[PDB]
């Protein structure tokens, strides 16, 4: 219950231990603008010409991370040491265009109620392992502090080929989603 | 080149675990009367927080007792500023010359690749394009001349 005509996330920082695992991203009406690659300390535009004119200085992301990192240690020992309610995911699949056997389309798996945000989302063609033409998103944010996520597959829509999304989480063991309607 | 700016994550001095931090700027007409929340979150519990409408670092839980003093006595004025220093700056200088003046037009009735959201269930595709499901065909959208039909 908080409304208004638009919303910006010029924060969004998550970090988690053990293994110590971070992301920094900015959203605007629930669409990732960029994410900072913390390893190559650089800004990664969700849509290449999104930062044609516009700049983002990555070191802001890096700082926010290292706050959270420090902020963890100090809220770890102050919840006694409470760990995280693993919740189990909730895939769904649909496509980009409506389907056009001959010409490219793109197939997207939508995984909701993730937490903590580590996951594999892999693609299956007739249960052969598909690694090419695949784009994932960063962990987007849900009002309740889960995350959601989004894997993308470019393909030549030939009936007969059949398409499967596999979601190897923790709270769940896998879960495939064959498509639907 | 214009520059997108960022709300600043505040430190505190002193079996898997998650920290989170959200930097929420909400806008009404843009410009006029604007709001800002910064959540400081443990696992799923939002322990600490700053609302633009409270102008002070509250807590929400029992785990923001030994935070929310130290955030007012270190981040308070800088943070209050964030409303204009960052929320505002970003709205005016960056979203307007991109993520508002780009729209994209659409394509038992289902319609693809449209932006922004307003049209006349709803799916977010998260690649700055949209879809919706409703049960000649008239889809009226604010990106258009002649509200495309067939």
């Amino acid at each position, epitope marked *: 219950d908080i409304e208004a005509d638009h919303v910006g996330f010029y924060g969004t920082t998550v970090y988690q231990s053990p293994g110590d695992i971070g992301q920094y991203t900015h959203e605007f009406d629930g669409d990732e603008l960029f994410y900072v690659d913390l390893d190559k300390k650089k800004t990664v535009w969700r849509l290449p010409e999104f930062g044609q004119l516009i700049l983002f*200085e*990555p*070191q*802001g*992301g*890096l*700082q926010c991370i290292a706050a959270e990192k420090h902020n963890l240690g100090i809220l770890t020992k102050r919840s006694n040491f409470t760990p995280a309610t693993n919740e189990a995911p909730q895939a769904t699949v649909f496509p980009k265009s409506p389907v056009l056997l001959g010409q490219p389309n793109t197939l997207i798996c939508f995984v909701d109620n993730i937490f903590p945000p580590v996951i594999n989302i892999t693609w299956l063609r007739n249960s052969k392992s598909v690694t090419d033409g695949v784009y994932e998103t960063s962990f987007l944010v849900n009002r309740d502090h889960s995350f959601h996520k989004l894997s993308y597959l470019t393909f030549i829509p030939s009936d007969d080929d059949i398409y499967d999304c596999k979601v190897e989480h923790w709270g769940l063991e896998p879960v495939l989603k064959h498509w639907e309607p | 080149l214009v*520059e997108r*700016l*960022y*709300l*600043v994550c505040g430190e505190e*001095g002193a079996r898997h675990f998650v920290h989170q931090f959200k930097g929420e700027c909400y806008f009404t007409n843009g410009t006029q009367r604007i709001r800002l929340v910064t959540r400081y979150i443990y696992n799923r519990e939002e322990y600490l927080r700053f609302d633009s409408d409270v102008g002070e670092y509250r807590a929400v839980t029992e785990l923001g007792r030994h935070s929310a003093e130290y955030y007012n006595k*270190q*981040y308070l*004025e*800088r943070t*209050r*500023a*964030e*409303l*204009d*220093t*960052a929320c505002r*700056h970003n709205y005016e*200088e960056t979203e307007v010359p991109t993520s508002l003046r780009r729209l994209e037009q659409p394509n038992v009735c289902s319609v693809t690749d449209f932006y922004p959201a307003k049209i006349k269930q709803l799916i977010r595709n998260g690649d700055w394009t949209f879809q919706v499901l409703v049960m000649t065909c008239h889809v009226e959208h604010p990106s258009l001349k002649s509200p495309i039909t067939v």
Partner: T-cell receptor
Amino acid sequence: TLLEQNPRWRLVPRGQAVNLRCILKNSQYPWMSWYQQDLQKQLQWLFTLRSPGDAEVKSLPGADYLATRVTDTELRLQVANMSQGRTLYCTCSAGLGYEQYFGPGTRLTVLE
Amino acid sequence: MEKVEQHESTLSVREGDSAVINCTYTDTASSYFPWYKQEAGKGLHFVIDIRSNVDRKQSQRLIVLLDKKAKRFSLHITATQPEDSAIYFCAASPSNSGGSNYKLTFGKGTLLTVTP
């Protein structure tokens, strides 16, 4: 208050090398930067070094600088190839968006 | 970069005149302007600051102010006093750009001598 620099006054048989150490005296001001004031007054930022073992080099007209945050409360500068004089000020700060508090500085005059 | 340039390299005014120092900065993201004070080859002393939410601040005799749009900002020492006499530097920093949050860009100095 706040910071102790060391030394205050030094000659630099040119180009050659010499160094100095600033010590924090209160941890409400944890961020510690380095500034140079050149010979016609005029401050330049050099380094801000947050976390210990964080350490960098800047080559500047006309000196060369190895700066290194060695502890929670020590900061160090080595300065060499020192061309003409300058004064070095250690700072410290409670944070981002917040005033710097300057040290008592170190004057460096070259010696031919 | 930020260039932050102090129009005016000297001022003499005598007691009870309002000394005014003027600066400009280039970079539209700057939002934290502190001013500093140096007497007689000693250290710098933080004097006052101001943020880009507000257009003016005022404290004790001093008052500082800021036309974001103009990218100009000024410090007004008021009812001057021989003790005030020093080199005053203005400075800038974008408090919400991570590239330089942690640093200050400084003007050149302005030497204020306030005469008995």
